[PDB]
Design a protein around this ligand. Structure first.
Ligand code: HEM
Ligand code: HEM
Ligand code: XVU
Ligand code: XVU
Ligand code: H4B
Ligand code: H4B
Ligand code: ZN
Lengths: 411, 416
């Protein structure tokens, strides 16, 4: 019940007591493990809301060494009063900042959590319109990008009330490339964004129909129809992709954007639901070079790179895919580093996470971690996280998935 | 109750009902996932007549179902026979056909095994009449010769007598039938395979005269009927090895690397209808990454990345040059090239994972599911350019099964 995790490369053994504080469910049972399911299933009556608020305030006042004190009891009483009256409540600025940093700290699928405490939280709870949302998002983008010296940030729009007045960013990321289905049946640009690229066109947008067209923002305030906004191109930092050895690499015409900024998740703090809460950090190189570039359901460039490398593509056992894969990921890192845009390779990031785990076990009693997501999509076993046992459990505050708004919106 | 899994690259959705026939626990709960724990409590293995007949009945029901004889007179008589044999003798014996079925289905049920497309073509050698360590040595030699087949490898398992009172166990003390020694030097470095240092020390203590090189095949340490284990040397003409060279880099051979051809796991426990076979070596053929990624490049194994990267003259100062990833690919090319050139059976990780997906889809169609452990099925390099990376997998425990068991030197009561 006081569980232990072993690193099989170093024999370091850590003891986990934090899991006992787990609140939500994993979708596993003792008869079946669902550890590789992408998304298991896992409005609030007045009954459900106050315990959730109590739990959150308890951990907040503990964190500032004021558990069971003056201010703690008062704030519990005050929030207790507000829920009885308004059937909801509002976080003080300090509690909102704490809740957001801890949602990141608790994200068991995130390898970059050693940075969790440096998050810049932009309070946008006074926003009322999509034009105002656009303004907050431009400021976020500019602040986070910082001319290539990327800084972590989250912007938090007003919380859900009755489900009718939801704030939503319809984009999955603030910055993503368009995808178009060609007449000849193929796909131009990013195939993952074909449907969204249509809900932009088939709703107003005017597509350049290129291979790397920055999508517009589709912003929904207070439950109204969403509105199209173009991010000022001067705010969208992009990196042309070249190789430090293959001069033909530059001729491939590849680029990527510097800022990874997830915008479709739900931030839950003390029972309150923030349905629009775009957050951003900086890339790990494999996210672009392995997944974005080489997935068969994405830009899928492996064949073309290997052909330009003149590798033997007759038999899989020549490992031509693996050879091209390494080079593509050398070029991504080389290009970001050359343009002075923050990026981390998978070796450095997983080493940081092991140190972060050791820190969290030593100072917090544990660190929930999802091995299936933490281990990078290339060279898995030469990174230290491959040999690290991890316990996965759900702590709150948390980031959660939510349905795509176009399947839900009372249009 | 039905359950769905999705392949996120193809959008193929499959429906699992087989998990309903699961009994053993996983280690997970509603509040914690233990999916990345190497040996959970439930995957490891002291058994009385109390719980044995229901385990036998379940196995015999499965067996007679697969042969389309469920409820037949042969089925009912066999249940009656096993029942009376249990109450009178406290255990029972499997027929040859049941043992073959059981061993094949233990492999079929091995959720961490990516090679299960081959499960129905397993050669089962019945060594239940064995009584002495020398008899074990002879059975293992025939297994190695048959399975090796001059490079054209064949899957096989040899099954020694089942456990009785746990005081007379048959055990192969080696973790694999063929493995290289490892020696800790006084300066703290290791010669050979660091994973085998502890077992190497036991062999030396038992009287093995060690050549003390980097690729010495370990002797067999064999325990019959709960007696002290005895040392045996596999005939070298039976140990097929492959010198590792690279198809473009002529300096690669000068690294002096080789590996053996036959992967043969010898420390696991085979459970069939409540019976425990503590000595059941099994063998197949290698997937290239097992050698090229894990054996050669794990920091805690031969750990050749640096010396390989040096000879390639990559930028080794910063990790963002991916010199480690670049060396890793070339080493894995060398392993596959060497085995194929010597006509020793091997499969690369692209082929093996593709076969597994086809196997898994077929198992969902004809069996209602396929228990699979993503953490183990995804290869240790180039994960997401294989199709299993994108495959949702349900992991649950079916019997018959292979289980872990403690190392015998930790439990054995020495005779002297
Ligand atoms: C600063 C550098 C960061 C790095 C290098 C990083 C890296 C990653 C990576 C590689 C993933 C895997 C997901 C995928 O492959 O698509 C991930 C997941 C995630 N990240 Fe981080 N991240 C960073 C910052 C942040 C920040 C600032 C937040 C929120 C404040 C965050 C929250 C999350 C969440 C919630 C997930 C998983 C979503 C899920 O549960 O499916 N990350 N991260
Ligand atoms: C025929 C070619 C085969 C291939 C390519 C293959 C491949 C693999 C691989 C790569 C693993 C992962 C384990 C590791 O990385 O150390 C594995 C696990 C396993 N294999 Fe197979 N295997 C084959 C045949 C067999 C046979 C014949 C059996 C038994 C009759 C078997 C039973 C198992 C079991 C029980 C495990 C799980 C070990 C555990 O639970 O920790 N395999 N296999
Ligand atoms: C801030 C940040 C930094 C970084 N380096 N990478 C990312 C992308 C990670 C990410 C991806 C997804 C898509 C899930 N996929 C199955 C479609 C959802 C998320 F919530 C998430 F955080 C974000
Ligand atoms: C027949 C066969 C074919 C193949 N290609 N590879 C293998 C080795 C895989 C393997 C490794 C282990 C050690 C686990 N670790 C804790 C050291 C245990 C096993 F039961 C197992 F099957 C076997
Ligand atoms: C099916 C499987 O769960 C799916 O492919 C997961 C596997 N691991 C992952 N890991 C990361 N970091 N990102 C992903 O999108 C995925 N996808
Ligand atoms: C901690 C983790 O469970 C452990 O390192 C596992 C990960 N996946 C693996 N997968 C395979 N095939 N073989 C292994 O030894 C491991 N080791
Ligand atoms: Zn689980």
């Amino acid at each position: 019940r006081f569980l232990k995790v072993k690193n099989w490369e170093t024999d370091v053994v850590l003891t986990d007591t934090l899991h006992l504080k787990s609140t939500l469910e994993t979708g596993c049972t003792e008869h079946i493990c669902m550890g590789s399911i992408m998304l298991p299933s896992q409005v609030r009556t007045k009954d459900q809301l106050f315990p959730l608020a109590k739990e959150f305030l308890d951990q907040y006042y503990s964190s500032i060494k004021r558990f069971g004190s003056k201010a703690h009891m008062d704030r519990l009483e005050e929030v207790n009063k507000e829920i009885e009256s308004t059937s909801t409540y509002q976080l003080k600025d300090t509690e909102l900042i704490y809740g957001a940093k801890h949602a990141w700290r608790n994200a068991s699928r995130c390898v970059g959590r050693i940075q969790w405490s440096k998050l810049q939280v932009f309070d946008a709870r006074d926003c009322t319109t999509a034009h105002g949302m656009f303004n907050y998002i431009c400021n976020h983008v500019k602040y986070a990008t910082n001319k290539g010296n990327l800084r972590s940030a989250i912007t938090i729009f007003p919380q859900r009330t009755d489900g009718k007045h939801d704030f939503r960013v319809w984009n999955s990321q603030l910055i993503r490339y368009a995808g178009y289905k060609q007449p000849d049946g193929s796909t131009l640009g990013d195939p993952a964004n074909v449907q969204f690229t249509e809900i932009c066109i088939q709703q107003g947008w005017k597509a350049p129909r290129g291979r790397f067209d920055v999508l517009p923002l589709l912003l929904q305030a207070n439950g109204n129809d969403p509105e199209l906004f173009q991010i000022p191109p001067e705010l969208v930092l992009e990196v042309p992709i070249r190789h430090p050895k293959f001069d033909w690499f530059k001729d491939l015409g590849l680029k990527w954007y510097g800022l990874p900024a997830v915008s479709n998740m739900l931030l839950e703090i003390g029972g309150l639901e923030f349905s629009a809460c775009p957050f951003s950090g900086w890339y790990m190189g494999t996210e672009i070079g392995v997944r974005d570039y080489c997935d068969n359901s994405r830009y899928n460039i492996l064949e073309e790179v290997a052909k330009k490398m003149d590798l033997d593509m007759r038999k899989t056992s020549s490992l031509w895919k693996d050879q091209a894969l390494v080079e593509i990921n050398i070029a991504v890192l080389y290009s970001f580093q050359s343009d002075k845009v923050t990026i981390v390779d998978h070796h450095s990031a997983t080493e940081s996470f092991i140190k972060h785990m050791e820190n969290e076990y030593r100072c917090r009693g544990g660190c929930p971690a999802d091995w299936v997501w933490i281990v990078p999509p290339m060279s898995g076993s030469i990174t230290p996280v491959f040999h690290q046992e991890m316990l996965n459990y759900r702590l709150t505050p948390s980031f959660e998935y939510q349905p795509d708004p176009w399947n839900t919106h009372v249009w």
